[PDB]
Structure formats: structure tokens, C-alpha cells
Ligand binder design. Structure first.
Ligand SMILES: *C(=O)CCCCCCC
Lengths: 37, 303, 303, 303, 50
């Protein structure tokens, strides 16, 4: 049937939310690098 | 006096700003806009912002306008309202920026935030460079940076050149002047100074320190060779060892194998090397071979 | 006298204004309007505003009209009705602005608000620049800016060049003149002055302060090299160390490796460097190599 | 005498007027009307207004007519019936306005209201400018502006150049002349004067004040560089610091690195700079580099 | 404005300035003095041990 609930091939949430970057440390620098892996 | 000429202070640094702008007023020595579309596009953006909408897909060929990149240096402790100097550089098929004027241009940091606004008249030297100019007091500071100067009881003097004896000399001088336990060397490039807590007391301390005088210790023997410009420089620590040298067209003033005596000071080195009668061009090759053999008791750097 | 030549006052700054305008009255040295559509379009806008509607899609080729950008500097504490000086610059394929007249033009800020209205006769020098001119008292101020001058008990004198000794000197001078606790240095670029509350008392204070005299302390040794114009400048703090130099076609007046003695003052530096017999063009390369080696005890800046 | 040469009065300002007109009587040096349609269109409008209707779509090629823009300056306190001077400028492909006559033209403000009517004979100089002229007493005032002069007990003298010492000097002079509490400085550009209420008493006050004499205090050291015309000007406050200078083709009258001594007054500066033997063209580059280094103790402005 | 990476592809310095070409000599190569500023620091075990 077409009314029986089936799960989709691509499961879970299909979107992501950007996260705010860290607060810049108050040295004399403009270049701020978030923790780099 | 001297320490201010050898070190910098931690937290007191410069940053860089860059922006895009237009230069108007040229005597027909601007871009050929049929090959630089961003020129006409940004001119249309400016006109639209001012209140004039030019129809799209129309003919437009200017001659008195050039698209430029503006670069500046954000100074330490900069306050809003002050002024800095900017450098203006052409960026497409322009002939000259002789008598141009820079229109309102925002200067961004690396985080894409506006830190200064630039506008003024360009001074081109007037051979000389035509597509590059400098504007004096051409930008005004709009944003300020936070800093943690004055917080804590420790500053760091950062040497300009690594050395252990030099760091120890600076430490000993500061301790001789400003009390027993005032300074401490961390490594070959840092001196940690204890300062009273506050903002004015630290300024008094750094004003007292920056004008002290220290005697520079002998550095490393080194020979700098700039092959691109064709220059050779040897500081006062270079020595030599006795050895023979041969090179094309060079002879004794005798065969082609010339002797070189030992040399303790620099005058002896200059004399013994001038004895060979070689241009700097050949002197480079001679010095490289001598360093490879073992005569040259120095440190060769090709810059 | 002196302090007014070293610092600025916080809140007393200049702004920039820009606008678009037309210049009429040229002797056939205006735009070729078949390639600058905005010229004819804005002329039609003006004619329509005045009461004359020219049909669209008609032939129109002018010669005595040019489209220009007008730039001006909004001064501190500007009051409506006053006058400022404007700079006029061509913006498309015009030959000259020799005897032109600038029509009514509004000058906007960065927030797109009208701050001044510009109109007058252009003065072109009359080689010289033809596509750029200046109008004296060519704009009138229409809008005023708010400000918080006179509110509070603290002003900031902002130095033009960062230095700790200089800020301390200015602070000590103000404290010696205007009482014990009148000033306080915040950093290498700011001096915080306590002033009485009000508007006239602060003017009296700043009038007393701005004419004081301070003795400038020795700055940093630096050498400025402008490669675009071909110039070299060395302030009075540069020193040298004994070392040998070689460069193409330069010789002793002796081989090609010339000596350079130690130099404490600037006269000795000038003498020892003139001894090499080099044009400034080669002097740039020599100085770069010497700074890389360690002879030049200065700070090289390529501007 | 002096104060009238330093300040303006609040509410006493000039405005600008602009209008469109026709100039007739030229010796075949008018527009080529086949490319300026607005000329023939406005001529037809005038003829129709007078009582003659020319059929449309007919051939019409004139030679003794030119279309012009008329500009004028609305003076302070202007009364209807008075006369002002106008400037007439060609606006399309005309050759000369030598012996032309300006027909009846209304001059509008920025609110598109008629403030004056212009008509007269043009005086072209007769190289000189042909497409621009001036008419003396060529316009008559038709509308008057309201004003609030004479209402209140406070006027504002607005300085022409910002300065705290200057505002304080003017305030002190007015207080020394016209009683204790007559003036008060608001900022670096305004002096608030208390005047009796009325219209004639304020005129008596401003007549007494405007002719006072004040001694101008020393201004800021500044150097003006006009690169477009090729000129350099230095006021009497510029000083110098000892430093060395090198530039292409310049030599000692000695090598290429020339010394410059310290200079306290302006005569010493002129002497030391003339010693280098440089044209103003090179003097610009030298001064820019010196200001960047630190010798020039002035304020460089590129106008 | 140019970032200078190490061998691990991390930014250690930022470079910007005016080039000084000798002005035969080399035209396609130049050197900038004090043209880069350090942005990252390296750890080290100096001072630890005997
Ligand atoms: C969808 O609802 C189809 C389900 C019918 C399956 C059973 C029919 C008797």
C-alpha cells in the first residue's frame, strides 16, 4: 500500500544549523583563529 | 635609546587593512573599461547609491576612472578619529594615476569588518612608478580594538633577533637599573618584566626601561649574498683560513692558483680577498666554494 | 605651540562628503556623450526638473558638458551656512575642465544624507592636470552633526605617533603646568585630562594646554626607502657597524670590496656611505643587504 | 577691521540660483541645432508663448542661438528690486558667446521657486574662454526670504577656521571691549554674543564688534602640496630635524647622500632645503619621504 | 594580504607590504623587509629537564 508508513532512504534531519564562532581574545590582533583541528 | 631599538612590547603590534576603490580625475590615462567590467559595474553601483539609475546593457566607455586597491597599516592603540597613511595601487590596464583623487573607500580587516575610511588626493612621484601612489593622512580610523594592556603584573619584551647572550644582557641591565628581581629571561627571544598593577604605573615603567642602554655582544659570523641584485656583505666576525683558489681568467699579479693567507680581523679578510682581483660576480662563486671546502669560517646566506 | 602639533582632541575630527554633478561652459572639451549615457540622462533629468521635457529616443550630442565627481571634507564643529572647499574630478572621456562651472550638487555622507550643497567656478592650473580642479568656498553646509563635547569631566589627547616616553612627557608637562593630578597616560597613544564640567571652561582648558611646549625625546632609528620615486631618508638616530661591501661596478678609489667604518652620529654615517660612491639606486640594495647582515642598526621601511 | 575678516554671523549666508536660458545675437557661432533638440524645442515654446505657432515636424536650423545655463548667488538680506551678477555658460556644441544677449530667464532655488529674473548683455573676455561669460547687474530679485534676525538675545559668530586659542582670543577681546559677560565660547568654531533685544540695537552691536582688532595666535605647522599645478607652500611654523637625503641625479656640490641641518625658524628651513638643489617636482617626493621618516615637523596636505 | 602556511597547512603568519626589486638584475623576484607578522606560536620543551 501507499498509506503504510515507511522510512525514507535518507533518514534523520536533512538540515544543519550554523554555530556562532568563539569570542575573540583581546590581544592586539585582528586575525582570530578558531580552534583548528 | 637602545632597548627600544632591540625589542618590541607584547601586545603592541600593527595590523593590515585592505579595500577596493575608484580613482577619478585622470587625464585620459584610466582603464580601458571594455576589458575591466568591474570598473563600470562599481561605477554603476555608486551612481545608483547616489540616486541615478543607468539602464543596463548600455554603452559606457570611460577614460578618467581607474579601479584601485588601497592598503593601510592599523597602528597600535589606534583611537577613532585619528589618521593614517594609505597606499593606492592600480589593478587593471591603467596607464597612470598622476593627478587622481581617491573616492570614499572602506578598509576591512581579515575578519571583513570596516576599520577605516579612506579618501584624498594621490601623490605620484613623477623613471618613476606611475601606477602606484601614496596618500598622507588619507584614512580615518572608525573602529577600535580591545586590548588587555594594563591588566596583570607581567609584560614581555620580545627581542628582534634570537640570542641567549643578548637576552641575558638585557635582563641583567634591567635588574641593575630597576631593582633585583625585575626581569627574567624565558628563552632566546623573550624577557619577562614584573610591573606594578595598573595602567599609568606600567607606562612609567616602560618609559623608564625603553630608554636604557645596553652593549651589544658579538653576533655570529655571517656572509650575505644577494644574487638577484648582485651584492655581498660580511659583518665584522668573518675570518679566513689559508688556502688556494683558482677561477677562470683570474691570475697572480704567477699562474692561476693564488694563495690566501689566514685572516683574524675583517681588515685582513678584505685585503686578502681584494688581492685576488675579482668582481663580486666571481666573488660569489669563490665564497661558495670556500665555504664548501672549509676556508670561510662564517655562515653563508643566499638572500 | 607644540602640543597642538603632536596630538589631536577626542571628538574633534573630519568627515568626507561625495556627490555627482555636471560642469558646463567648456570650450568643446567635454564628454563624447555617445559613450557616456549617464551624462545625457542626468542632463535630461535636470531639464525635466526645470520644466522642459525632451522626447525620449532622440539624438543628443553635447560638447560643453562633463560629468564630474565632487569631493569635500566636512570640518569639525561645522555650522550651517559656512563654506568649504571642494575638489572636482572628471569621470568619463573628457578632455579638460578649463573654464567650467559646477552646477548645483548635493554632497552626501556615508549614510546617504545631504550635508552640503556645492556650486561655483572651477580653477584649473593651466604639464598640469586638466581633468581636475578645485573650487574655493564652493560648498555651503546644510546639516550639522551632534556631539558630546562639554559633557563629562574627561577629554582624551590622542598622540599622532605611538610612544611611551612621549606620552609620559606630555603627561608630566601638563601636570607641571596645570596642577598635580590633571593628566594621566592611558597607553602609548592617549592622555586623559580632567577638565571642569561645562562648555566654556573646557575651551579655556584646551586653549591653555594646546599652546604648551614639550621637548621631543629621541625616536627610533629608521631608514625610509621609496623605491617608486627613488628616494632614501635616514633620521638622526641611525648608526653603522664596520663591515665590507661589494657591488657591481663599484670599486675602491683597490679592488671591489670596500670597507665601512663604525659610525656613532649621523655625520659619520653620511661620510662613510658617501665614501662608497654609489647612486641612491644602488644605495637601496646596499642598505637592504646591510640590514639583512647586521651592519645597519636601524629600521628599514619600504614605502 | 579684523574680526569681520575671521568670522561670519549666524543667519547671514548666501544661497545659489540656477536657470535655463537662450542667448541670441551670435555671429553664426551658436548651436548646431540638428544635435541639440532642446534648443529648437525651447525656441518653439517661446515663439508659441509670444503668439506665433510654428508647425511641427518642420525643418529648422539656426546659427545665432545658443542654449545656456545661468547661475547666480542670492545675497544675504536681499530685497526685491535689487540687482545681482550672473554667470552664463554654454551647454551644447556652441563655439562662442561673444556678442550675445541673454533673454528673459527665471532663476530657481533648490525648492524650484523663482527668486530672480535675468536678462542682459554678455561680456566675454576676448587664450580666453569663449563659451562662458558674466553679466553685471543682469538679474533682479523677485522673492524675499524670511529670517529671524533681531529676535532673541544671542547671536553666534562662526569662525572660518577651527581653533580653541583663537575662539578664546576673540571672546576675551569682546569681553575687554563690550563689558564683562558679553561673549562666551561654545566650541572651537562658535562665539555666543549677548545682544540687546530689538533690530537696531543688534545692528549697533554688530557694527561695534565687526571692526575690532585681535592678534592672531600661531597656527599649526603645515605644508601644502598641489601636485596638479606643481606648487609647494610652507607657513611660518615649519621646522626640520637633521637628516640625510638621497635622490636621483642630486649630488653634493661629495656623493649622493646630502645632509640637512636642524632648522628652528623658516629662513633656516628655506636655506637648508635650497642647499639640496632640487626642483619643486623632486621637492614633493623629498618632503613626502621626510614626513614619513620624521624629519619634517609639519602637517603635509596634498591638495 | 597573504597567509603563510606550514607543512601541516596551518596559518602561521600574514604577509603584506611593498616589494624592493634591485634594479643585469633579477626582475621577477623581490624581498620585503618586515613584511609578515607572526600569528601562531609553537610549543616547546625548553627549560624542562636537566
Ligand atoms: C492501503 O491502505 C492498502 C491497504 C490494503 C491492504 C489490505 C486490503 C484488504
Amino acid at each position: 500500500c501507499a498509506w503504510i508508513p515507511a522510512k525514507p532512504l535518507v533518514q534523520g534531519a536533512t538540515t544543519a544549523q550554523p554555530i556562532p564562532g568563539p569570542v575573540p581574545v583581546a590581544n592586539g590582533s585582528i586575525f582570530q583563529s578558531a580552534q583548528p583541528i | 635609546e637602545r632597548i627600544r631599538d632591540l625589542t618590541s612590547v607584547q601586545g603592541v603590534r600593527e595590523n593590515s587593512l585592505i579595500g577596493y576603490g575608484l580613482v577619478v580625475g585622470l587625464d585620459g590615462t584610466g582603464d580601458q573599461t571594455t576589458q575591466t567590467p568591474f570598473t563600470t559595474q562599481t561605477l554603476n553601483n555608486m551612481l545608483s547609491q547616489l540616486g541615478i539609475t543607468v539602464p543596463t546593457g548600455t554603452n559606457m566607455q570611460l577614460k578618467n576612472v581607474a579601479a584601485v586597491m588601497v592598503t593601510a597599516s592599523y597602528p597600535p592603540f589606534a583611537r577613532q578619529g585619528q589618521t593614517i597613511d594609505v597606499v593606492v595601487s592600480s589593478m587593471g590596464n591603467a596607464k597612470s594615476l598622476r593627478g587622481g583623487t581617491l573616492l570614499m573607500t572602506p578598509l576591512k580587516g581579515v575578519d571583513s569588518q570596516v576599520y577605516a575610511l579612506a579618501q584624498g588626493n594621490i601623490l605620484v612621484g613623477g623613471v618613476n612608478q606611475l601606477n602606484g601612489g601614496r596618500i598622507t593622512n588619507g584614512a580615518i580610523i572608525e573602529r577600535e580594538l580591545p586590548t588587555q594592556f594594563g591588566a596583570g603584573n607581567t609584560i614581555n619584551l620580545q627581542l628582534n633577533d634570537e640570542d641567549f647572550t643578548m637576552a641575558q644582557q638585557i635582563t641583567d641591565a634591567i635588574n641593575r637599573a630597576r631593582g633585583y628581581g625585575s626581569a627574567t629571561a624565558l628563552d632566546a627571544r623573550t624577557v619577562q618584566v614584573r610591573v606594578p598593577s595598573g595602567n599609568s604605573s606600567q607606562v612609567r615603567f616602560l618609559a623608564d626601561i625603553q630608554n636604557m642602554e645596553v652593549n651589544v655582544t658579538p653576533q655570529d659570523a655571517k656572509v650575505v649574498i644577494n644574487s638577484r641584485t648582485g651584492s655581498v656583505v660580511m659583518n665584522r666576525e668573518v675570518t679566513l683560513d689559508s688556502c688556494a683558489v683558482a677561477q677562470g681568467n683570474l691570475s697572480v699579479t704567477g699562474g692561476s692558483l693564488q694563495s690566501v693567507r689566514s685572516s683574524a680581523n675583517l681588515n685582513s679578510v678584505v685585503r686578502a680577498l681584494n688581492a685576488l682581483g675579482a668582481t663580486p660576480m666571481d666573488l660569489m662563486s669563490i665564497l661558495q666554494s670556500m665555504q664548501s671546502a672549509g676556508c670561510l669560517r662564517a655562515k653563508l646566506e643566499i638572500i
